[PDB]
């Protein structure tokens, strides 16, 4: 409750069960996994347990919004998340994730990639755990939510029973879970920077 999150705020986003932050960096998924599956070779999105500049995300409105400074983000509004350190937009799509062929790969894309043909795939919602809470204010620390992908209806998920390989620096895998109702899909806004 510490504070209300407004559009264009910079935030950190923390997983409740593992305490890992939603994280990104310049490293890319390997073109192929050991089982032969093909990734997008896109920018990695991971779970990182330590405070870091690369945990910062800017919350943005959809195209054609007319939103300005000082306006609260509400639960279940469509939003976009820009990775501050690399200036890329979060995206999910129907590509098998590193460890779970049934779950979706999560990546980021450049401003140009994200504002053109792929724009619809950059839309998320802070989805309330109880749908009756839609339209309530997003606040730091005290409001749990699912990071829900509008286009494919997955919730972002992570775990720490198995960590990524050396190419992922033993960070937590992040992927899109098609089973939306799962406590391991729950996140909070940890702080407003």
């Amino acid at each position: 409750d510490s504070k209300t999150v407004n559009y264009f705020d910079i935030i950190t986003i923390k997983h409740q069960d593992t305490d890992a932050f939603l994280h990104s960096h310049l490293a890319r998924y390997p073109q192929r996994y050991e089982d032969g599956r093909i990734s997008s070779a896109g920018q990695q999105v991971t779970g990182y347990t330590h405070p870091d500049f690369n945990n910062q995300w800017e919350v943005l409105p959809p195209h054609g919004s007319d939103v300005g400074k000082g306006q609260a983000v509400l639960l279940n509004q469509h939003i976009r998340l820009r990775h501050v350190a690399t200036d890329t937009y979060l995206l999910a799509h129907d590509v098998a994730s590193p460890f779970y062929p049934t779950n979706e790969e999560i990546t980021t894309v450049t401003l140009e990639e994200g504002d053109g043909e792929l724009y619809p795939e950059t839309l998320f919602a802070f989805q309330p755990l109880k749908k009756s809470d839609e339209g309530h204010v997003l606040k730091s620390k005290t409001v749990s939510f699912r990071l829900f992908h509008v286009d494919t209806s997955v919730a972002l998920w992570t775990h720490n029973d198995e960590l990524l390989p050396d190419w992922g620096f033993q960070q937590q895998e992040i992927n899109g879970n098609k089973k939306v109702i799962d406590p391991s899909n729950n996140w909070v806004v940890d702080e407003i920077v």
């Binding site: 599956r37 093909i38 990734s39 997008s40 129907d94 590509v95 098998a96 062929p101 049934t102 098609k178």
Partner: peptide, 5 residues
């Protein structure tokens, strides 16, 4: 390339 399944 590889879709989910």
């Amino acid at each position: 390339k590889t879709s989910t399944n």
